[model samples]
Each structure stands twice: as C-alpha cells, then as structure tokens.
Target: QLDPATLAAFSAAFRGELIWPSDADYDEARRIWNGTIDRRPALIARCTSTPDVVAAVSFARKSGLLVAVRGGGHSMAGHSVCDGGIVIDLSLMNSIKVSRRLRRARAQGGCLLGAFDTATQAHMLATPAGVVSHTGLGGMVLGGGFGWLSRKYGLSIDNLTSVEIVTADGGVLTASDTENPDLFWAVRGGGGNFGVVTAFEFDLHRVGPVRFASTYYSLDEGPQVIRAWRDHMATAPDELTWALYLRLAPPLPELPADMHGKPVICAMSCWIGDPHEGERQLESILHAGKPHGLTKATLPYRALQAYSFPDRIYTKSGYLNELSDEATDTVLEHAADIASPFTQLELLYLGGAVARVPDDATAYPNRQSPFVTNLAAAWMDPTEDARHTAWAREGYRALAGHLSGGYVNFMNPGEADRTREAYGAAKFERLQGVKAKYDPTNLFRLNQNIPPS
Candidate 1:
C-alpha cells in the first residue's frame, strides 16, 4: 500500500501536477506507446524539475514501491509504469537548452526527437535519433539510438557527453568521461537499470540543408533493389545514410491512386555533406529499380527528416547484427512472400562513423553490425492484435539465424531471454555490477531489467 505521507511529500516537492488512481487522467497516465503493454501504477508523479525527480525516487524507495521511470512513456515493453507501484513520470520535463558556444546541448529526459531536432536545427546541428519523431530521447540515447544520421555521425550514445541521473539512494549525480567514468560507460548504452536520468548532455555536430534522396518502387522489385542496395552499401561513402523498407503505401495524394494498397519498397537516403556530391553518389541506388514515383529532392535538413517518413501509428521490433550473404538473401526472400498489408520488413544500412567506434568505448555492443533488420507487423485495428503479433513472431523466427543481437529499444517483455542474448553475458554482468552500486535493491526495475549483483 502507498504511504500517504510519502505521497503528500512528493506532491509538495513538484511544481507540476500529480495523478492518482482516482484522477480522471490516471488511465491515460498509465498508457504506454505500445498497445501491447497495459499496466497501472499506484501513483504518477509528473515531475517538472530535477528536484521533483529526486523526491519521487526517494519516496518510492522509502515506501518500498516498485518504481518505474517514464520519459515520454515510450517503452516498447511497457516498462513506463508498474502495476500498483509509483511512476516517476518525466513527461513534464521537456526542456532543451543548446549552448552553441560550448558545442553542447542539454536536453531534459522527457524531450522527444522532434523537440530535440527543432532546438538543435536552429543552430544547424543534429543528433542520431530513431526514425519516428515521437520517440523519447532518454530511452533512445541510452539504448544507443540509430537513425538516418548514424552513418554520417555515430549512434546517439556516441555523441552523449554526460547525463544527470537521480540514483535509487535519492542522491543526484552527474556522469561524464571525467566524473563517474564507470557510471558514464554504463549509461551510454545500458537500459534504465542504474538510475533515473533527468537530463542528457550531447556533443552537437553541424548539419545543414542538403539533398535528401528517397523514393518507392514496386514490391516485385524488392529483391533486386535489396541486393543492389546491400552490395552498394558495402562500400558506400560515410556521408551517405540510407535504409530500405517494404510496406504498403498509405492512401495519400503523393501516391498514385491505383497503387495505394499495393506493397512497395521505400528507400530513404540522406547525404549530410555536399549536395551535388550527394546526388552524384546516389545515382546507382536511384536508378536501380523502376520506381513508382521519385520523391528525392533538395530541402532543409529538418524538412528532409520529416519528409522521408509518413505519419502513422504502428508496432515495431528491430534486431541489430551483421548479416552474411546468405542471411541477406533470406531477408529478401521473406520480403518477396510477405502478404500482410500492414506489415513491413526493413533492412537498414549501418556503418561509417557508427562502425568506427571501439566496441568497449561505451556500453553499446555490436558496433560492427553492418545491417539492422526489423520484422514489424503493423496494423490499423486493435482487434488484429493476435494476427499481427503472430505474424511478427513468425517473421522474427525466420530471421533469427541472421540476428547476432537485438536492440534494447525494440525489446518486448515476452522476449526476456532474447534480451539477455542482446546484451551478452559480459556486458550483462557489468550492467549488473553497476545496478548493484546504484540501485542495489533493484528499485528501478521497469525496463529490460538488469538485476543487482
């Protein structure tokens, strides 16, 4: 049971609103981005500042409440909230401060990718974020975010300079290369095991208006295009970033009416360097397949980021690993036979700056994985949950041989065993040690949990 005194203390500490089970927005407060996760926490603390976060953690620890830290509430495994526990929601802490003079940007944990992009883009700077705009910056960066910018820059975690975290013991600490180095290493790619990160400091890179090449081809051309892309990306320049996706195009004016519901292969590429050179380098990929329509154009970097993806809510799970020639073939073969209109099989190109990082440089492992594949079954209907889940499972099973490790950001609760496989024994052991030091009792056990040693 919740301690009324502790609850009142939390309410008094935060300037923002707090929600209980009796509140009207309580149900929504517990809702996560993934529909697959349905849980209800005893209290939801919408923290406004780092002090509030510290208070919430201390209260939960004292009350013996299983604490869940929420940053934009986008956990795929629904770890944002716990059943009959306290949820330290940081969604109200969406603040971004960019220090152009210092070449660093400090983002509050609740800031989304879009918010980060908007703030950083003003100074012609960018960071690695997921494909979607709504994904929380905290979880994405902590789990090693990969996006169109990864090839040119590195994973988001690579650019992270420091993080301000509230430990389970109620003390607020900062982790950086010079301070708390071990904790810094663990927070780089480790899931939320050690503590609740209230803010992130990232080393910003300059990015600007450039030619963003993207287009869609008929589904029949998927195999040929994929093979060509795989071979081309093997030696693709560092400035060029790309990903291949196979899905049915939504009915939009940009798409042909006749091809609205047909399966298609969408190729998205971004060149962060010279626009002319970017265009010249993309000739082979641009001309590989008979495109349904070419959407390639030169635009502002922010606009390009928004253009390549459509607005749609869908379920997704991704695997990161090196794909052999045979495994590549397997991916293409499945893409050829997939029948669900709502499903998509994506094989993203990963390398360049991302691969140059040392394996032990940060907590993120598998930096050498050249290919990342996602077997996602997306559907529009809530009633189609079973069918979509089964489809995703079957698809993932077929591609299991190719998976060397899975991305923590895409992990589901049902794949706990696979989560261990993703982090590996050595890294998992190290993570456990960090957990013991910071959160010994495992108070912060909401995510793909790493237990105390």
Candidate 2:
C-alpha cells in the first residue's frame, strides 16, 4: 500500500471527493445497476469535472493501480468496476447544455438517458438513444446506440458530432469528423477501449409527442402473427419502429387477469409522425391476428423514452439477415421453454437509416442485417440464477446458426473470447490500431477490450 502522505497528496489534488474502503459510503458508491455484479474497488473517485478525471487517470497510472471508469455503471459485463482497483466514477459530473438555434446538445459523460432526454426535450429537440432511461450516454453511444427514433435518425453514434475524451497518457483531446478523425471513427462503436469520454456533442432533431401502440397475441397464434407483422414491416415507412417480445404477460389493467402469467406474443410500435397516419400505418399489424389485448396512447417523446428496467439480468443477442421460417421456429421453440417468468425473447426490426450507413464508416458491425434478436433473462431472486442463465445460454446456442455478429451493448462477460467475431476480423483489426495509438500499454483493458497492436 502507498504511504498515507502520498494518498493525502493525491486527495488534495483531486477536485472531487475520494472514498476509501473504510469510508461509510464506499459500499454504496461501488454498487452498480446490475445486482448480479458485486465487486469492491480500493478507491472511488467521484469526479465533478474533466480535470478531476485527468487527475484520477494520472494518479492511477503513476501509482500502478488498475482503473475502471464508471459513467452510469450500467455495463452488462460489469466492466465499470474492478475487484481491486481505482474507480473513476463520473456519476457526479452529470450536466447538459443545449443550443436550440444550432440544433445541438452537449452532455457530460455521466448524464443518464433520462436526464439527457429531459434536457433536450426542453428545447423541443432530441437525439437517438437507448430504450432504458437509466442507461449512460457514454457507453451506449460508444457501442452504437439505438431506440425509437433510430429508424428516422439512425443510431446514436450517427448523430454524434464530437467528443471530449481523456486518453490514457493523461491527455485531453477533442475528436470529431475534422479533428482526430481516426479516434472519432473508432469511438463510434469501439466500446470503451480507447479512453474515458468526458463529454459528447450530438446533432439534435425536432421531436415532440409520439404515438405508441401495443397488440398482444395468444401463444397459439404467435407464428402467424409474427409473420404478418414482419411482412408488413418489410414495406413500412421509416417513421415507424416495430419490436416483438415473447414473454409472460404483465399485470397491466388492459389485459385479462387470467392471462397475466401465461406466455404471449407482443407487437409494439412507436410512430414519430402524425397520430392519424400512425394509426393508419398500424392497421396492418392490428389485423395480423385476433388480438387478446391492445393499447394505444400519445405521449411526449421524453415520457415515452423514460421506461426503466432495473432487474438482475443475463442476456445474449445476435443479428439476423432475415427472419426466415426456420429462424422463427427456433425462436418459438426457445420461447416456449422459457424458465423464468421475467424472461423475454425479443426481436427488433433493423433497417432504414441504421442500414443506410456504410459498414466501414464506423467500428459498429453488421449494418446490413435486417433484425437483431436478444434472449433477456431477468429475475430478482438470486436462487434462480442457474435455471435462468442456462435457459438464456441454451436458447442462444440453439439459434446460433441463424444468427451472426452481435451488438456490443448486449454482450455478456463470458463472451470476451468472441469479441473479434462480434466486430468481424477487419473492424477488430482497425480497433486494435486505434487502441495502440491512444493506449499502447492497455491501461483501459477492463471493457470490451481491443488490445493495442
């Protein structure tokens, strides 16, 4: 351990509060969103500004201490915290500024989706982001973010105009299309392999209230309903985004009380245009099959984006060039065997702006795929871990042949060996080159790592 004098000096230099293991709030500070992840760090730096991040990075480098960067602490693999290391927690740095005239927004790295949405919505404008409001802007954008507006606006990275990042050597750099262009390309979907991003600037678009629709089908008619919905969406407009979910029904007021625990197929859509046209466009989905239940409402984009899920989870996902009949059969087979009531077999339509982007333009892979599938196993009880995890793993394995590559945001800890396959060999090699230039010693190896060449 370092001498107390050195530790004291380090604390004095930091602009933010530093918590040690003995501190009263240390345990709480180390806690992350995923309850399944429990790791203790030697120190927690609650940074309030970019300089605090620089100081933390420099101190960790000189002290030979392992470092984990925590923005929203929502990393599915728990890479935001280490067993024994210094955690550069940016949670306290949350801040946002919007330029209504320029149609741009600058957000601190620690800002959560909810806060960012509220800030941007204040100006009657927004950007593409994730579904969950609790997600961090940094990791999500770095891993290629998508949500309700993705079809019209493209992935979050596609709107990302610039970033202020602190590199491993304690250097601050501004990266954009014209400045540090290579780094800009890598950060678009390179995960946190390069460095700690302190701020993000995004091109915002006009977004107001939106129409949300949900239709539920009995499990017996899932096959027909899913096919009809898919066929309809094949020709749907870019203003619409349709998602499918096979899971136990929730206890919502609109659903029949007896159907709450039974498995059902849910087709949901978010339409960003006029409500009349949105309803007209959804008629095809509604007539797909006899609906067991339905709900439709018009709410602000901010309200719609504020949905949250805070449960212990295990997830596996991959892209599908086409949701063929065999693929649908495989998905249904696993959906029928779901071990946990909280589990969901999700399929999201991917096309429009997300596919229009050239594959090599950013580090994100599989832009040509038509859909993405996710086996999300969620449960509150730790005792059911074995059954839930096995169900997810086995389900993904059974559908492996029908899938290709995966979203880095959905990757789990054990998939580290498959990182190259996920990014593809060429993109992975490019990421490695960027890592070598900015972090040759691999100081930031805890994330979806792309080790220096």
Candidate 3:
C-alpha cells in the first residue's frame, strides 16, 4: 500500500535538493557540529535561496509533518534536527552583503559568524556577535549574542535593524522596527519561535585589531586575581572586556613546577581602546598573581572570536548579578571535580551596553546581568555521558541562588522549566503573544519554543 502523498511530491515543488533516508549523502548531511547531538531526520531539504525556503515551509505545513530548520546546524539542544521529521536546512543559503557607506550588512540566516566576520571585516566593519566564529549568525542573533565587543557595543540583537523571515503560513515577510514592528521586537531575541528567518540586517560599527590580553594564574592565586578582575570591571571603561576560565593548565615551563598539570585560572582581557591605556589598566591584574603565561596582542576582531571546543560536551549556563568570592569558590571547587580533563567552567563578565538595555526592551531579558557562567564537561566515551552531564548539572545546581537568568543560546530544550527562567515571566508571556500571532499551531517548535497562548 503506497501513500497518497510522498516526499517526491514535495521535492517536485522545491527547487532545492531533498535527501531521503535512502540517499547516499543523507547520513553525512544530518550530522551537526556537536557529537553529543545525534539526530536522524527522515528528510533533509537543503535550501539554496529564499524561494526554496518558502517551498520547504509550504510543503511541511501542507504535508502535516514535523519540521526542523537548520542554519549553521549548531543548536546546542539538538533542535536543529529531529527524529522522523522534515529538516528544512538553510545551510546552502549562506550569503552576506555589506554596505560600507551605511555601515550595515545583510547576512543570510545560514551565514556563520566566521563568514560574516570575513565579509564585514574586509571593510573594517563589524557587529557584536558570538565569540565562537562557527556559530550561525541567524540563531545566535535571534537568541541574543555576546562576544568580545559586547562590553563596548552590545549584543548582536542590539545591532539588528531588520530581518526577513518565512512564516509558518508559507509567506515571506520583512520585519524591522518600521515594518511589522511587533515581530521586529520579537525576533530581536525571541529565538526562532515566530518563523524561519532568511536574512538579518545588522547595524555594524568600526571595530577591529583589538588588544587581546590573557594570563594564566595558579589556583593558589586565583582568588586574588579574580577579585582584582572583579573590582577592576566596575571601574573599567566599556571599551575593555574580560573573562576568567577555570581549566586544567598545561605543563608549561613558565608555570611553577608544581602548578603544572593542575586546574588554573585563565584570565583574559580585550581592550578595544588606546593601546597604552589598555596596557596600563590591565597592568593592575599582573600585580595580583605571578603569571604562568602572559599572552597579549593587538589582534583582529575576527581573531579574537576564535573558539575551538571538544565535540562531545555537556553544557549548562546561567547568568549572575555578580561574580563574588562566594560564586567564584563554588565554580573553582567544581573545576577540580570535573569528570574529564577536557571539561571547563567559565565566568564571563557582562556589563556596559548589556546592562544599559532595559529588560523589557527586547525578548532577551537578561540585560541587567553582570556576569554569565557556563559549565561544560566534555568526554568522548558515551559511557561517560551520565558522569559528565552530572558534573555540569550539579555544578549549576550549586550556584542556584546567585544565578540571575539564562542565555537561550547555551540552554538545552530537554531541561524542565528553563523556558520561564530564560525569558522570565513577563517576557515569556510577551513572546507567547508573538508566537500566537505568527505561529499559532507551533510549526516551528524545534528550538527553545515560546508556545502560543
């Protein structure tokens, strides 16, 4: 008995290639960046342009099949792909266009941070986005982004001027502050609840060749160095930003012989201002502890965005009002108990324009947070999943009271009740309105879903 309709009917209308389970490249096409996220979709509709996106969404809606959209295919929660569903992949739609005169760029939803950076940087224009170069520009901006330029400028959403999205109804709409104002507001930081965004128009600024400074300090001096960094942040100008990573230190000769091969604090700073002034301000940090390794440079904005992480990582994160000694000690203590040598915990400083934005201004409600901490436990063996995940979960549980809110980009959808925690009560309610308005049946529910009221 054959079905009344099949993938062939949908593929017939779609200009893009559709890979079925039997296709030779189907297996390779479904694999995402994170090894931990292993999802097998029944179909992968590889879109090449806006028209292809419309056809894909239409087919999904009419066919009554579950749908998942993939941009750079880097959803931490594995929401970019799903089991037994139509994966509307936009990976082939990657394109970027820059207008140097207006200092803005229009990047396709499939564009990666690395691609966006390369295009925009050619004219010395850039926007504040994800620190990880490989991150998808579309999903990252939709969920609110942060990187080296965050303190100086703001989140990627802050620079978002407009977006072109393909709604659940198979209609393409251009959302901006002036057009579909409510949707414009929602997509700024609402994740992909409303629709599949095809392109993003961003407000770029002059930034690059920033001063990157970092030093490794013994856990013995972690306290002093962290405190110095904490205090210095409140006084430091917006042009500078920093974060402290607690990880295993390499057996380098510069370290005290005993401190090698042990958990050490990697304190990094990026000053996007006067080189000499940046040197003077960061100089105070060197005084706090004996530097095992101090690496500083006038690096490109793109270079500063470099990030390479282990494939299988159990990641958890939350925001904080402050990074006090109490919070610092809790994380530092867990670093010693990490399940694997590849695991790491980070306390990133968040302030300046991030704090300046009103909580209600966008769907991203954690603007007032002073810091965000991430606990990542990476291990190759599947047998170690429970152990590594537990380390991440328990460590986050330890910092319960101190946490402010959560970053959507770092969250896993499988977690219970994290939706309200990420957007807060008011913002979540508002997001529901946008969802109800655009995606009433929840056709695009694969991501951090903001369900319709």
Candidate 4:
C-alpha cells in the first residue's frame, strides 16, 4: 500500500485526476480500444499537460512502480495499461494546432487521429497517418503509421519533425533531426519503450478532396481480383493507395440483405487526383472481377481517413515482398475458414514512396516489402477467445513461408518474441543503444520491449 502522506503530496503536485481502483471511474478509465485487454491499473493519471506527465513519471519511478503509458489506449497488444501499476493517461490533453502557412501540425500527446485530421484538413493539409482517425497519433507515429497518403508522402514518421518527451528519469527533452537526433531516430518507428512523448510536431502536405472507390465481389473471384490488384498497384502512381479485404460481409444497408454474413472480397482505393483521372485510374480495379456491389465518389480526404475496424480483435501480420500465386491461395484458404463474421484478412499494397525511403533512414524496417497481410479475428464473446485467437495464429502460421518480416504495429499479445526479427540486427542494436541511454532500467517495458544494453 502507498503511504497516504506521500500519495497526498504526489496528488497535490499533479494537475490531473488521480483515479484509484476504488474510484467509480477507474473501470471506465482502464477501458481501451481493444476489448480483449481488461487490465486494472492501480492508478490512472489522466494528465492534462506535459508537467503532469513529468510529475506522474517521477512519482512512479521514485516509488519503483511499473508504469504503462496510455496515449489513445489503442495498442493492439494492450501495452497502454497494466494489471497492477500506474497508467499515465494522456487522453485529456487532446489539443492540436495547424499552421497553414508552414504546412505544419502540432498536437498534444493525448490527441486522436480524428482531431489531427480535422485540424489539418481545415487548412487543406495533412500528414501521412494511419487509416483509423480515432487512433492515437503518439502511438501511431512512433510505430510507423500508414494510410491512404503513405504511398504519396511516406509513412507518418517520415513527416514527423520533432517530439516533446518526458524520459524515465523525469527529464523533459526535445527530439528532432538536430536535437537529440538518436532519440528522434529511435522513436520514428520504435514503440513507446523509451518514455512518454508529451507532444508531436509534424510537417504536413497539401491534400484535398480525393476520389474513393469500393467494389465488393463474390469470394469465388478472390484469386482473379487479388492478382489484378497486385499487378495494377505494382506500377500505380503515388497518388493512389489500394487494399484488398477478404471478409464476411457486414450488415451495411448498401449491400443486399442476403449478402450480409456471406464471404466477399472488397477492393477499396483512394486516388488523390482529379475525379476524372482517378476514375480512369480505377477502371481496371473496378472490373477486375464481376462486382456484386460497387460505390464511387469524390469525397473529402478526412472522411477517407476516418475508416475504422471492429473492437475485441486479435491481430497478426506479416510483410511480403510479393504476393505470389501460392500466397494468394493461402490467403483465400484462410478467408474461407474465417472463424468469426467480424474477422478480416487484409492485403495492403505497399511500395511507392514508402519503399523509396533509404534503408537506414529510420528504425522502421522492410521498406521494400510490397504487401502487408493482416489477420484480424474479431468476435464478441470473451468465452470464445481460444477459438478465435487460434484461427488468427493458424492463418499466420500457414503464411509464414511467404513472409519476409513483420510490422511492429500489427503485432498482438504474446508476439514480443518477434521484435528483434522485425527490426533486424542492425536497427535493433541501434535502438538498444538509445534505449540504454534513455531508460536503462527498462521503466517503459510494457511495449514491444527493447531491453537496455
């Protein structure tokens, strides 16, 4: 038990709510995006500013308490919370500023992707970010974000200019190209294993309305559709980003009622160009297979960035240099065997500017991989965890031979063993050196951990 007097002193210095397990809101505070994670942190520090974060970290370190940093609480592996430790929650500090003249964006640590997109889109500007607008910018950028604009601009980390971080020793520092460059490099793709980033500054780009296309075909046409998409995207311009999804159709009013719950192949893409040109570019994809459903439109880029997925999910992913026939066959085989209606197998097309980045430019690896396959199994029943999780694991195992490496961001619970392989020897070693300097005792080991050297 914490000494009441010491706890009172810490609380007095904190500028945010200190939620204890006995508090009525503790359960709500602990809930995160992934419902599979149900940890009960001893304390939840809902920080409203950088100083609150520094104070929380200092208190946790001084008390020798394990700490987990919750920046949007969207970690697929549940690194944002702990069972019996302190949770430094940044959710209250969701503020953003966009400099239209400079094409720059600065967001507080607690800001969500939706708020960031809203702030930047008002200026007709954007920084490459993840697909789900609700995802936390802090975690996404640090783990190498991807979205519709990544092909044109690059991963989110590529656009990051700097971060205000509170380290394990309670020291606040700035990381950027010229200031604490090592920390900057490590954080670009390294998970939140170093410290808590209180703020992020990014260089943005001009992006306005985009042509969006969605076509759903019968699962029987998966092979042809997959091949056509892979081939077309191979030479596609950076202005376009496309992905293929194998999933049991959801109950959307756009589809026939009978089609709901049936397996289907959905090809979705966004073309950041003239409506006519985007339509022309998407011709082959639209007719790749006989579509049972189709949709096309010119919409604001922010809406496209708002795409989302289901909760209560277990996910695993791999990077493939190419999606060969065998790989396509394997993917379909799993798609046919999906254990839940909410489960989805995503084949995200990579390359373009994402692959053009120099190999050692940042800690993110597999820059040349052309495809990323994600096996996401989502089910509502907690009692069915074993059945659903096994499906994702089995599906991943079947595709192992075709996988080159893995994306750190897609790794789920218990996949920490793959960390070194994800970054390779060189980058992982470099990350360790930075980790040693900033968090030698591994105070921030809740993430895909990099132990101090």
* Ten contiguous residues with the weakest lDDT in model 4: 303-312
Judging by TM-score, tell me the better candidate of 1 and 4. Answer: 4
lDDT of 1 by residue, 1-453 (tens): 666787678667767778989999999788877766678887888988999888888888888888888887677677887888888888888899998887789999989888888898999888777877778888888889988788888999988988999998989999999999999999988878888899999888888777777778886676678778887888888888778887777676777888787767878887878889878876657877876667777877677666646111233355545556677666666665555675788878788998999887887877888887777765556676776676667667777766777788877766656667777788888888888898888887777778889
Candidate 4 residue lDDT tens string, 185-229: 999999897889999999998887888888788878888889888
- CA deviation > 4 Å runs, candidate 1: 308-329, 336-342
True-structure RMSD for candidate 4: 1.2
After TM-score superposition, the amount by which residue 213's alpha carbon in candidate 1 deviates from its true location, in angstroms, is 1.8
**What tens digits encode model 2's per-residue C-alpha lDDT throughout 279-386?**
777665676777767877887899889742236888899998878888788888888886567789998987889989999999989888878899998899988888
For model 3, how does the per-residue alpha-carbon lDDT over 112-167 read when each residue is reduced to its tens digit?
88999999998988999877788888788999998888888899999999999999
TM-score of candidate 1 relative to the true fold: 0.94
Model 1 RMSD in Å is 2.2
Q: How close to the true structure is residue 145 of candidate 1, measured as C-alpha lDDT?
A: 92
Clash count (model 4, backbone only): 0
Output the TM-score of candidate 2: 0.97
Candidate order by lDDT, decreasing, is: 4, 2, 3, 1
Residue-level error in angstroms, candidate 1, position 267: 0.9
Name the TM-score of candidate 4: 0.98
Best by lDDT: 4
- The count of residue-pair clashes in candidate 2 stands at 0
Better of 3 and 4 by lDDT: 4
